[PDB]
Design a protein around this ligand. Structure first.
Ligand SMILES: Cc1cc2nc3c(=O)[nH]c(=O)nc-3n(C[C@H](O)[C@H](O)[C@H](O)COP(=O)(O)OP(=O)(O)OC[C@H]3O[C@@H](n4cnc5c(N)ncnc54)[C@H](O)[C@@H]3O)c2cc1C
Ligand SMILES: Cc1cc2nc3c(=O)[nH]c(=O)nc-3n(C[C@H](O)[C@H](O)[C@H](O)COP(=O)(O)OP(=O)(O)OC[C@H]3O[C@@H](n4cnc5c(N)ncnc54)[C@H](O)[C@@H]3O)c2cc1C
Ligand SMILES: NC(=[NH2+])NCCC[C@H](N)C(=O)O
Ligand SMILES: NC(=[NH2+])NCCC[C@H](N)C(=O)O
Ligand SMILES: NC(=[NH2+])NCCC[C@H](N)C(=O)O
Ligand SMILES: NC(=[NH2+])NCCC[C@H](N)C(=O)O
Lengths: 549, 549
């Protein structure tokens, strides 16, 4: 059967094909080769855009105020080799084909993420209202869980034509996908996931306890209460495109993706010599942080860095989170329309906390001889840890445990504590669920924790779309199409997690980056190959619908 | 006409009559007089309860881990006498009769708060998408504003029977009020304010710009977008009891309320000698913070403070924010049911930021001769300041300006910055709105700002009720009614902002405090005077409805 991929629904453009096509992403007039283009941010969107723009014969100049890779971050444990903790993105649905084009281009290895109730996870434990349920396969779980999923499946079918939409994504039936999706947009934009569940027949006839459980752990593979405040359109996008299943981690860390792009020598270059990489073009590193972006008197854009070095560019791509433009960067008002500023100012963020420890061996695989249970499991609970993940690197090698993976309030509970106290609170809660298991006695190396908002170069882990925010996301997603814009707003671009329709998923950032690649190519008078048309070529036809005032 | 008051709708008990009635709140047996009851928190809920329990002849012992007065907090500017910035609650609707009982008992002066489009405010300025509208009265605004309000009024009438609910509150017609209120509870518990507006007929026929405006500034007297994610029941409670209009500030600072309660000598004391106050009973200060609460081997509760001093009490009232019980305080699991712990952990909190400066005079009253406009006004904007308040202390005296009053995301945008940066960013934004006013040249004293979550004894400014949370709040609001509880769960009580049905409004804190006074009096074997029945005497009849599973 034809695979689900992140194919629209909003802009069902075949990004994978475009990348894969042997003609390449187009060209720029030789008169403009070597000319510079500024990119704010060295995250995935920034680097992808830079790598392809280098390939088209430009010299991208990448600015990074903090850490390379952005929210793709793999930190090594003390004293080990290649045993990492994933601090940002960690599980990558195979439906993320544009993302995976670069994984494979770098020849990196992946393996299935140990999600609850998947072949990759041996067992799962669900812990609710002080009671514990053990499961080696879904069916082992009590009846209430199956009832929960049936209502979910039923609510999606009733309320979204889920099956029709999934089929249209599989066959890449564009007119059909847009027909289905377009009738949904004005009906769910301004309603939350909460309202979805509240007004669905299936959930209504179930108990309050059923709903409660659905929020905490879903039907036993992960909960939904962090997402409840979101526009129901966001949630649809996630489940429709199977973002939530068949996921992989990158072996040795997904940070290798942005680090590898940086150092990768493409087989073919416009203008540039053999062996040119983003790294060689920069002398090894991106520029420091951007502090100011202004319209210069000669028409160009002035980018001043933290150290006062001011440079002039025909174009600038920003990928830093939207609120930074309006607070931390001095970004001149004339550079965006009044309605673009309002879209950027209304982006909201979800909070995330994760805490990791390394262990001497995957002791959790050991069986308790009394009960036949694994000593520990992929753990879902209403206690403060929420989610606990188990990473086996072999019996031969040390294991990693993500003790706690929380969002929103639960992440806010962890925010003010030092690492030590987070690890201790987690271990306490895990003692309650597994009173006989001695996790602490297997722990080696240093603990590793992360709170994203706590970083000054981030506002949260990723955006979450509020109800009614379709129009703001729509203006942002279309910002790379500049034919109709006043001159004073052109030549600046945006891309990234904020611009994407599926914010907590790395593919949306890659996709938005590629749209920007086209917007920038176009801005330098370039165009796509006739047999490999690009985002801007088809966007007025199949692009995200616009809503009437 | 008979006044709107915070009278139900959930628990329409006339707290004002109870407190005013010459019989007093009841009695406790003489054998129990002088006996101690522990109170965790020296905010308004703790002090109120301590004050009345002391009058019934008990010896309350108040613990405060941080500052007295809690979220009622009034900080003096450098070098001035009685010129303060309100850091917690600042505007108190006259419907808050139980709160005002204590204000009047202490003889404090109030004056109308300078809300937009009130007699207290000369002018208001609305700033949206770079466009500025000036108004001396509501009608001076563009038509869109009046349309917004007509839709809002219509939606409340259609959706909630607002006019009948307000009439019944006025007449204090309990059966009627509960009839009308109880049909709403199951319908709107699990839907947001967003969905209410979305799905209202009146808003549906208006443009998106109408809704947008309604979030940002409402119909010109304050916006609603920080409240959009909340259970609609919460919003109904606020508009129905007129919490949002006819508000006063306390002259010289609302912090005089709790401080004054601390010092106040009641005219009549059971047990205690002439001249007894909370302060004399404590030798001048509350005890330090609380670290531990446990059940002691003699049946009483053991409270251990930060320094290890352990003391025993027949009952304990806690008013600290609910998550502190589950994290910062070591509260023994046996003291609460499993379902109570769950209600306590589900509390989520709203964020707030305020920044204030003092000025040499209320220069904003001056007129621009060209336009006839006040040089500045109460300002509502989509820029980062959001809300700006002007406080006139007389032509004779310095002014106070609340430069910025923001919630949620807008508040989080400010969180990480020092005061100097906040002030500057505010001043920059106000310059855009008033390019001709020189605010900075009037500023004297030190700038004052607050971020509540940043404090380690607070999680946010106040709770916000999520959809679906009615049952949790119901369990918590009724926790004071202990006749059905297991012995091991009795004698501890909760009260406060978190316990209340109207969480950003001081009355709910006072009201819940008074319910627990009743619970504690009941616990010591006391009772209310036959002609002045108290909360627990009628609670089973008119108390908050309980929802089936
Ligand atoms: C906790 C968490 C879990 C996640 N899990 C998953 C997952 O399981 N699966 C999945 O697919 N995706 C996941 N993601 C999403 C993925 O991590 C992001 O979508 C993606 O990495 C965003 O890339 P980007 O370039 O858009 O932004 P980023 O990677 O943030 O890049 C933007 C960069 O701009 C930089 N910057 C900021 N200010 C300035 C300045 N003044 N000057 C210069 N540079 C600046 C920042 O420092 C940052 O490096 C997760 C994200 C988080 C936070
Ligand atoms: C920014 C803001 C604006 C507001 N505006 C308004 C308004 O305009 N109108 C209005 O009516 N209401 C308003 N309020 C609400 C009002 O201020 C609160 O409802 C009320 O003051 C809360 O009172 P409380 O006694 O329940 O809690 P607090 O005043 O929070 O409680 C008392 C104390 O518990 C203490 N404590 C914590 N941990 C411990 C421990 N471990 N041991 C001992 N003690 C501990 C804390 O230090 C705190 O002092 C506002 C609140 C805020 C934050
Ligand atoms: N069994 C219990 N409910 N214990 C106390 C619960 C504390 C809270 N739910 C937490 O772990 O964050
Ligand atoms: N509202 C959200 N998108 N929440 C996070 C869910 C998706 C995210 N990529 C994860 O690994 O969990
Ligand atoms: N509402 C506006 N005029 N926005 C345009 C940019 C304003 C800027 N982001 C601010 O918060 O002050
Ligand atoms: N509708 C609300 N609860 N809004 C949030 C702030 C409320 C607060 N009591 C005030 O008047 O400032």
């Amino acid at each position: 059967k034809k695979p689900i991929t992140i194919f629209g629904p909003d802009f069902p453009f075949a990004f994978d094909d475009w990348l894969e096509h042997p003609a390449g992403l187009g060209s720029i007039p030789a008169a403009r080769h070597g000319e510079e283009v500024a990119i704010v941010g060295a995250g995935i969107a920034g680097l992808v855009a830079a790598y392809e723009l280098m390939k088209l014969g430009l010299k991208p100049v990448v600015y990074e105020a903090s850490k390379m890779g952005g929210r793709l971050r793999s930190q090594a444990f003390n004293g080990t080799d290649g045993i990492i903790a994933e601090l940002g993105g960690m599980r990558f649905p195979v439906s993320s084909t544009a993302f995976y084009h670069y994984v494979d281009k770098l020849g990196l290895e992946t393996k299935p993420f140990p999600n609850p109730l998947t072949p990759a996870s041996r067992s799962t434990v669900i812990d609710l209202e002080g009671q514990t349920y053990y499961a080696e396969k879904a069916a082992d779980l009590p009846a209430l869980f199956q009832e929960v999923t049936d209502a979910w499946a039923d609510a999606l079918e009733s309320g979204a034509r889920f099956g029709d939409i999934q089929q249209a994504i599989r066959d890449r039936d564009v007119p059909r996908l847009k027909e289905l999706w377009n009738t949904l947009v004005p009906l769910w934009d301004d309603r939350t996931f909460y309202d979805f569940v509240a007004t669905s027949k299936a959930f209504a006839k179930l108990s309050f306890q059923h709903r409660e459980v659905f929020g905490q752990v879903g039907f036993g593979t992960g909960g939904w209460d962090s997402d409840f405040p979101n526009s129901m359109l966001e949630i649809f996008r996630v489940v429709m495109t199977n973002c939530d299943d068949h996921q992989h981690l990158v072996v040795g860390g997904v940070e290798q993706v942005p680090q590898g792009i940086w150092r990768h020598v493409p087989e073919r270059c416009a203008h540039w010599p053999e062996g040119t990489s983003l790294s060689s073009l920069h002398g090894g590193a991106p520029r420091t942080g951007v502090k100011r972006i202004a319209r210069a008197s000669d028409g160009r854009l002035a980018v001043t860095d933290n150290w006062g070095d001011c440079r002039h560019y025909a174009a600038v791509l920003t990928t830093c989170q939207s609120w930074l433009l309006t607070t931390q960067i001095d970004c001149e008002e004339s550079l965006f329309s009044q309605k673009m500023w309002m879209a950027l100012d209304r982006t909201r963020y979800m909070q995330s906390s994760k805490t990791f420890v390394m262990v001497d061996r995957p002791f959790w695989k050991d069986k308790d001889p009394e009960t036949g249970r694994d000593l520990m499991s992929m753990t879902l609970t209403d206690r403060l840890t929420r989610g606990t993940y188990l990473f086996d690197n072999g019996d031969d090698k040390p294991g990693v445990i993500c003790l706690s993976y929380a969002w929103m309030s639960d992440a806010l509970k962890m925010l003010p504590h030092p690492v030590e106290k987070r690890v201790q609170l987690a271990l306490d809660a895990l003692k309650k669920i597994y009173p006989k298991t001695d996790i602490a006695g297997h722990i080696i190396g240093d603990p590793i924790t992360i709170s994203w908002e706590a970083d000054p170069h981030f506002l949260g882990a990723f955006k979450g779309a509020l109800p009614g925010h379709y129009r703001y996301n729509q203006r942002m997603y279309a910002h790379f199409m500049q034919a109709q814009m006043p001159v004073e707003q052109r030549g600046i671009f945006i891309a990234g997690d904020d611009v994407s329709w599926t914010p907590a998923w790395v593919e949306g950032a890659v996709q938005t980056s590629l749209n920007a690649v086209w917007g920038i190519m176009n801005h330098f008078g370039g165009k796509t190959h006739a047999d490999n048309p690009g985002p801007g070529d088809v966007f007025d036809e199949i692009g995200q619908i616009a809503l009437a005032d």
